[PDB]
Design a protein around this ligand. Structure first.
Ligand code: HEM
Length: 154
């Protein structure tokens, strides 16, 4: 697929708001993912023992992870579709070491769209959400195709 420049602008306009607070958004998104799909927490050995949302909000490790996830995702979105290089290493570790099914990437995409919608209503109307969804589907589709080349899942 191919987003138009206008769609990319809507995606990078709300992303610029997220970058004002990367660690806070990172927490909100991972906690939303873990509350919505608790099985995903099990993939994080460093903090899968966390039992509540308050323990999650106080975990430094979870917050660092969120910053790591959003910084790598922001670098991919800023490429506007030319992200082959950025995707390689990422697909190799998620397919061979961590073992993250495409279904989990769909879950966190959902969590991202939920948090932006809450925190950025004015910059996240229907057209901006449609563009963000399009950009995340593009990211999942290219990662799924790399997973297949690397020998993992479908
Ligand atoms: C927006 C999508 C995501 C991005 C951009 C992303 C990015 C990253 C990056 C940059 C790292 C560190 C470098 C590396 O290990 O590759 C990482 C590590 C990891 N990711 Fe992802 N990730 C995403 C989704 C997920 C999801 C949905 C899960 C699990 C349910 C996941 C599980 C992990 C785990 C287990 C690690 C290792 C953490 C540690 O060091 O113990 N990732 N991810």
């Amino acid at each position: 697929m191919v987003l138009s420049e206008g769609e990319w602008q809507l995606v990078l306009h709300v992303w610029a708001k997220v970058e004002a607070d990367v660690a806070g958004h990172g927490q909100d998104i991972l906690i939303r993912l873990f509350k919505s799909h608790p099985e995903t927490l099990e993939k994080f050995d460093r903090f899968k023992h966390l039992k509540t949302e308050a323990e999650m909000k106080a975990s430094e490790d979870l917050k660092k992870q969120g910053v790591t996830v959003l910084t790598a995702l922001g670098a991919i979105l800023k490429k506007k579709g030319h992200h082959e290089a950025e995707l390689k290493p990422l697909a190799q570790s998620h397919a061979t070491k961590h073992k993250i099914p495409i279904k989990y990437l769909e879950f966190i995409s959902e969590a991202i769209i939920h948090v932006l919608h809450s925190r950025h209503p004015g910059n996240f109307g229907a057209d901006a959400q449609g563009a963000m969804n399009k950009a995340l589907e593009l990211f999942r589709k290219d990662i799924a195709a790399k997973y297949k080349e690397l020998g993992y899942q479908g």
